Swiss-Prot record:
The chain crosses the membrane at residues 10-34, 45-68, 80-102, 123-145, 176-200, 318-341, 350-373. GO terms for molecular function: alpha-actinin binding; calmodulin binding; enzyme binding; G protein-coupled adenosine receptor activity; identical protein binding; lipid binding; protein-containing complex binding; type 5 metabotropic glutamate receptor binding. It is found in: Cell membrane. Interacts (via cytoplasmic C-terminal domain) with USP4; the interaction is direct. May interact with DRD4. Interacts with NECAB2. Interacts (via cytoplasmic C-terminal domain) with GAS2L2; interaction enhances receptor-mediated adenylyl cyclase activity. This is Adenosine receptor A2a. GO terms for cellular component: asymmetric synapse; axolemma; dendrite; glutamatergic synapse; intermediate filament; membrane; neuronal cell body; plasma membrane. Its main location: membrane. GO terms for biological process: adenylate cyclase-activating G protein-coupled receptor signaling pathway; adenylate cyclase-modulating G protein-coupled receptor signaling pathway; apoptotic process; apoptotic signaling pathway; astrocyte activation; blood circulation; blood coagulation; cell-cell signaling. Belongs to the G-protein coupled receptor 1 family. The chain holds residues 2 to 305 of 412 of the full protein. Disulfide bonds join 73-161, 76-148, 79-168, 342-345. The cytoplasmic C-terminal domain is necessary for targeting the non-ubiquitinated form of this protein to the cell surface. Keywords: Cell membrane, Disulfide bond, G-protein coupled receptor, Glycoprotein, Membrane, Receptor, Transducer, Transmembrane, Transmembrane helix, Ubl conjugation.
Amino acid sequence: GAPPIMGSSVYITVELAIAVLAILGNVLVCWAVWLNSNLQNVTNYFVVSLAAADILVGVLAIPFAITISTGFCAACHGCLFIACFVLVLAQSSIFSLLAIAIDRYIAIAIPLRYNGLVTGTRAAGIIAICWVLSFAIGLTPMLGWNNCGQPKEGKAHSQGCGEGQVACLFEDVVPMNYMVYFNFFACVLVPLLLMLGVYLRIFAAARRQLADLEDNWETLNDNLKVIEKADNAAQVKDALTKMRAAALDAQKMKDFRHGFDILVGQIDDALKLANEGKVKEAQAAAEQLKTTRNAYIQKYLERARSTLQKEVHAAKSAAIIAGLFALCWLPLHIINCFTFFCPDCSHAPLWLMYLAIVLAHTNSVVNPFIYAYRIREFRQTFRKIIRS
Ligand SMILES: CC(C)CCC[C@@H](C)[C@H]1CC[C@H]2[C@@H]3CC=C4C[C@@H](O)CC[C@]4(C)[C@H]3CC[C@]12C
Ligand SMILES: CC(C)CCC[C@@H](C)[C@H]1CC[C@H]2[C@@H]3CC=C4C[C@@H](O)CC[C@]4(C)[C@H]3CC[C@]12C
Ligand SMILES: CC(C)CCC[C@@H](C)[C@H]1CC[C@H]2[C@@H]3CC=C4C[C@@H](O)CC[C@]4(C)[C@H]3CC[C@]12C
Ligand SMILES: CCCCCCCC/C=C/CCCCCCCC(=O)OCC(O)CO
Ligand SMILES: CCCCCCCC/C=C\CCCCCCCC(=O)OCC(O)CO
Ligand SMILES: Cc1cc(-c2nnc(N)nc2-c2ccc(F)cc2)cc(Cl)n1
Ligand SMILES: CCCCCCCC/C=C\CCCCCCCC(=O)O
Ligand SMILES: CCCCCCCC/C=C\CCCCCCCC(=O)O
Ligand code: NA
């Protein structure tokens, strides 16, 4: 049995390196949002809340984790707090991630009423509520759901602990049924699955709207060919009526409105000629629609397409951060499931526990890099902060 301080040294050194990185990177995130007005929106307010949680991981949770690794003597409820505080930060992260997903869904599903529904004031209140709920959920063991009533007295005595004191170890004070059923299944897995559902609805909404834009564009060009090859005024009329409906459907801001004002008007002119039985005159009038199409309508099509592709890209960036949270925290939770559900299985080795802990902590480092590589406004703001 090699000296415990050696393996501890590696684990502690790595934890400290992660702490420094988690603090520096996320302070940079908060600083960027503070300085740049272009980054000051509801979505990034939840980003800041998420960054704040990761800063507290470096400042508090990792020092707590280092202290716990020693198994030092402590009052059981004191040990409980140290042990549970990371649950608060993880829970807060989950709420922030869920809020970001919902915010992006609202932005893509109902953009016309997004600004009136999703404000900074309401977002601030939501963030406040979610932090309170995170403390409630994370510190639930301090409300009585703990193992302090049945301390490991043999372990405490061997370490020379005083009366009322226990060897401070996570699994000795935090019940595994809490960790598996309440924390993991209810408070982590269900919100993550809800998140997945939201992002599925986001991407499906994007795909449908991009399809609708193309269908309108196709309806516009197809009916133009119909009018040109028509032989009677009735055929011209039917094609124009479908165009007028498609034009108004695509219409649903000054150069934009004027472009469609021309289009609908030109359709009405051709429609009037069509209802008079003047086929040739109707077709010639309908030919003018191509000029409006190339000068105005096509420009609106590409810009609308460009805006949706940007929303898709932004939603993907947010989903990546959500996925990374899951990837980093799932090993710890899975290990707890094995410990809990399979008492006939040997406990996961200490080195693997340390690795799972380090991995969870690394998640507090990765987000600033995702923002830098995927979000131009962040990356450019980061450069300005660092250079100056
Ligand atoms: C505002 C921020 C910076 C304050 C941080 C306060 C932290 C460091 C304090 C608050 C409560 C404290 C714990 C309260 C009770 C005990 C029981 C004792 O037997 C060992 C120490 C221990 C486990 C303390 C460790 C440090 C602790 C977690
Ligand atoms: C989320 C992604 C990365 C998947 C994570 C899978 C990891 C967490 C899984 C895969 C295989 C698993 C191990 C398979 C077998 C055992 C032996 C048992 O006596 C204790 C648990 C232990 C040691 C498991 C711990 C968790 C484990 C390491
Ligand atoms: C987010 C997605 C991946 C769902 C999470 C899957 C989790 C809940 C699954 C994946 C693998 C599962 C484990 C696989 C094998 C065993 C060994 C058995 O003796 C007891 C149950 C136990 C320990 C399972 C518990 C639940 C488990 C950890
Ligand atoms: C916009 C900024 C957001 C900032 C807003 C953040 C507010 C966080 C404070 C929570 C205190 C309430 C937590 C309640 C959970 C109770 C469990 C508990 O405290 O028990 C410990 C104990 O004394 C057993 O001895
Ligand atoms: C600028 C940011 C603000 C600063 C944020 C604060 C940083 C907290 C640091 C360490 C927490 C570790 C505390 C635990 C130390 C306990 C060891 C101990 O108590 O040992 C006595 C004992 O009874 C065993 O015998
Ligand atoms: C101080 C500490 C303890 C644990 C820990 N140590 N042992 C066991 N069995 N589970 C957990 C743990 C697992 C999932 C979770 F969300 C929080 C803590 C994990 C982290 Cl990141 N920090
Ligand atoms: C920016 C402020 C951050 C605060 C710095 C914290 C750094 C210290 C890290 C870990 C302290 C661990 C204390 C070890 C517990 C005592 C071991 C024992 O009693 O056997
Ligand atoms: C750990 C379980 C937590 C228990 C939750 C029950 C208490 C919180 C319930 C609802 C929080 C809703 C916050 C609403 C604030 C009012 C906003 C307003 O006045 O406009
Ligand atoms: Na986090």
